[PDB]
Amino acid sequence: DAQLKFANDVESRIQRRIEAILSPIVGNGNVHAQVTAQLDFANKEQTEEHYSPNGDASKATLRSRQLNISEQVPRSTQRNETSNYEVDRTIRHTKMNVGDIERLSVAVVVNYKLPLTADQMKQIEDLTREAMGFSDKRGDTLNVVNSPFS
Amino acid sequence: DAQLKFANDVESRIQRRIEAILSPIVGNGNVHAQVTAQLDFANKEQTEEHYSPNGDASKATLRSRQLNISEQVPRSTQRNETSNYEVDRTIRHTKMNVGDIERLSVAVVVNYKLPLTADQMKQIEDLTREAMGFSDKRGDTLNVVNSPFS
Amino acid sequence: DAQLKFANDVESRIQRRIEAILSPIVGNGNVHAQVTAQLDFANKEQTEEHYSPNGDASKATLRSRQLNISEQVPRSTQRNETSNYEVDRTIRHTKMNVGDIERLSVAVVVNYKLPLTADQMKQIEDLTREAMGFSDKRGDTLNVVNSPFS
Amino acid sequence: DAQLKFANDVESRIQRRIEAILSPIVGNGNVHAQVTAQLDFANKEQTEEHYSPNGDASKATLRSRQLNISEQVPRSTQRNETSNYEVDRTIRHTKMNVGDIERLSVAVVVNYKLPLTADQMKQIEDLTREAMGFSDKRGDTLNVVNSPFS
Amino acid sequence: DAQLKFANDVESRIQRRIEAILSPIVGNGNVHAQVTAQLDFANKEQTEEHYSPNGDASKATLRSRQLNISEQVPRSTQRNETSNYEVDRTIRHTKMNVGDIERLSVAVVVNYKLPLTADQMKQIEDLTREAMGFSDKRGDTLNVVNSPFS
Structure with a gap:
């Protein structure tokens, strides 16, 4: 019932934050991200x-x-x-608590400008990792790819 | 429900503080920051x-x-x-207490002016670390990157 | 809920005190400070x-x-x-008591006038340390940096 | 809640006393002081x-x-x-009693007139120490510095 | 709450007494004193x-x-x-009793007339010591300094 709405809100928060931090570097709207949150609701x-x-x-x-x-x-x-x-x-x-984040997964696309170099890609990956709330404990996964838009 | 609003308020506090301390050095609006707070609500x-x-x-x-x-x-x-x-x-x-900060993660972008040197970058990183409330106990993470704006 | 307001009040007190003591030496408005207070609310x-x-x-x-x-x-x-x-x-x-200060962290920027010397910087750091309520027991941290304003 | 107001009152008392004793020696308004009081409210x-x-x-x-x-x-x-x-x-x-002073810290700035000598500085430090209610038991800290005003 | 008012009254008594005894020797208003009283309110x-x-x-x-x-x-x-x-x-x-004096500290400034000699200074210190209610048991502290007024 409401669990989907709560998960959608959390995903929207993380997505808007990632896009708002990564936009000033690469441009106004040359990046998109979608996150999938594995929430846990088991009373414990x-x-x-x-x-x-x-x-x-x-x-x-x-x-x-x-x-x-x-x-x-x-x-x-x-x-x-x-x-x-x-x-x-x-x-x-x-x-x-019921409603914590057990695992995340983030996929981000960045635009050409025509390839972006390796150092800039690495620092962008690192910014995204830090803006997620990344944690190798929960088994989170990130992957940023560069491909021309259309 | 309200946990998201409380976390958003804490993140807004830390973000406005970091930007307000780092603005007079680098300029009016040549810096942005986004923070992700891992809050804990488990009654204990x-x-x-x-x-x-x-x-x-x-x-x-x-x-x-x-x-x-x-x-x-x-x-x-x-x-x-x-x-x-x-x-x-x-x-x-x-x-x-229910509502403490268990872990933080901060990502900051600084503008060119054209590269900023290494000493200025290090002191800016240090200012940010001190303005966060940084603590190697909680496993907090910081990363400041320099890239031209657009 | 109200914990954020209480912490904000404490931080405002310490900030206004530091600025009011350090202003007569360096000038009217050539210094800024931002403090982050780790408050404890656990009933004990x-x-x-x-x-x-x-x-x-x-x-x-x-x-x-x-x-x-x-x-x-x-x-x-x-x-x-x-x-x-x-x-x-x-x-x-x-x-x-619920509401004591467990740890502080202060970041201060001072203006050029053009570098300020080392002795003046050291005495300014010492004034700030004494005006904070500094204590190496709580693990407090201070860092004052000098950089031209804009 | 009210603890901040009580602490502010105590600090105001000590500050006005220090300034009122040290003013007749150095001048009308050529000295400023700010004190930070570590109060204790734990019922015991x-x-x-x-x-x-x-x-x-x-x-x-x-x-x-x-x-x-x-x-x-x-x-x-x-x-x-x-x-x-x-x-x-x-x-x-x-x-x-709830509301005693566990520790103090005082920072005082004195004006030039152009350096003030060492003996006068030492006697001014001593006057301040005696006017505080200084006590090496509580771990109190004092530091008086001389720097030209502006 | 009222403890500050009681302490202020005691300090005012001792201050007016010291000034009233020391005035006829040195002059109408060529002396000032400020006292800090460590009162004890712990029911015992x-x-x-x-x-x-x-x-x-x-x-x-x-x-x-x-x-x-x-x-x-x-x-x-x-x-x-x-x-x-x-x-x-x-x-x-x-x-x-709740409200006794556990410790005192007195600072007195005397005017030039141009230095005052050593014998007169010693007898003035002794008058002040006797007018305080001095007691080496409580650890009381006195210091009288001579410096030109302005």
Whole structure:
């Protein structure tokens, strides 16, 4: 129902931003872009519970203790040891948001003026990458191609 | 719904600030910038509970104790020791805010006047970095390019 | 919602103060500054509980005691010792404030008059640092650059 | 909300005081100052509980006692000793105030008349330090610079 | 809120007193002073509980006693001794006042007439110190400087 409208709005934002940043370099209307946004709407909760290790005796936190030591001499021995500890704790209750951007894909066409060089193409690709909100974490994809218009 | 409007407002703030600081150096309208803000809306709580180590006998905090020591002479021995401790404690209840900036990305175009030199470009990049609120913690990204306008 | 307005007010205060202190040295309007304030709105509590160490017998605080000592002569021995202590205590309930400044970033442009020397630039940087409320604890950043206006 | 107004009032007080003390020496309006006050609004309580040491037998406060001593002659011995003490105590309930000054930073410009000498500059710095309410505990910072006005 | 007004009143009192005592010596209006009062508003209670030592047998206060002594002759012996004491006690409930002066700082300028000598300066400093309510306990600070007026 409304999910399509929300996705369309996000795509329109990113498209107008890319065109508005790249227009002053190449011209008024010699560039077009279309973006496809993979939105996620799955309601999601979470509850971590982290404990810091207290195995090493250097920073254990003893609340109690009992250390009995017998020794006879045929060197019989004995060593009992009860220990009650205290432990750190961290608890988060993260309730994710419905409507985030999980992945993007952008295709941009640039006009001749007649080929545009390689350095200018690379810097234009870089401007677009930075204007998208690019992130190699989400697996985003970009491809800018140069071909004469008609 | 409103998340897009809030993000648009934040982006507009940062954009107008960058342009207003960089305009007096390069000219009235010979620079443009577009920023993409990755906002986070996930409701999040937290509860730490930290304990200071009292393993070392130099600063333990004994509440009780009982130290029995027998010894016969065939040097039989014995050593019992019960200890009850007291421990420090820290407890925080951090309820994060919904609407913070998790990551930024800024693309800026500067005009010729005809190339601008390298030192001026570097100081302009540095001004922009400082005016953004840049932070290598959040993974922010900046790229300023110089190309003739049309 | 209102967080942007509060941040804008804080930034306006710091900006007007920096410009008002630096204007009489360099001129009426030959300087501009823009500041970006990283505000924190996360509601936060805390509860410390500190205990002073009473391990050393020089300043323990005994409430009770029982020290039995037997000895026979084959020098058999015995030594029992029960001890009940009293301990210091400190308890704070710190409820942090929502709306503090976690980090600042300031960019300032100064006009030619034609380069300004190095000593004057250093003292101007120092005036700005002192007028900000600078603090190397919060990780604040400052950068003042000199470039001709237009 | 109102925290900014309170901070502005405190800063105005300190600024007018510094200017009013330093004006009669250097002139009517040949000095300006701007101060940045780091105020603290975190609600804070506290509860100490101090105990004076009674380990040394020179000033213990015995409420009871029981000292049994047997001895046979093969010099067998015995010594039991129960002791009940009384201890001093101090208890404070300090509820800190919301709105104190945690740190200050002052920047002052003085006019030529043409350089002002070093001794006069040092005594002016000292007057300002004393008029601020300076304190090396809070980490306050002062810097007075001399530069011709325009 | 009102704390600033109370502090201003205290400062005005001390300032008018210092000027009124120092005026008849140096002249009608050839001296100015400005004081900065560090007031404390933290609500504070207290409860001491002091016990006088009764370890020494010279002034113990026995309520009961039981001293058994056996002796056989191989000189076997025995000595049991139970003692119940009575102890002094002092209890204060000090509820501090909100609005006391924790620290002062005074800066005074005196006019030429042309330097004023060292003895007169020292006695003027001493008059000011005595008129303040000076106290090396609170860490108060005074500095009087002589410079020509304009």
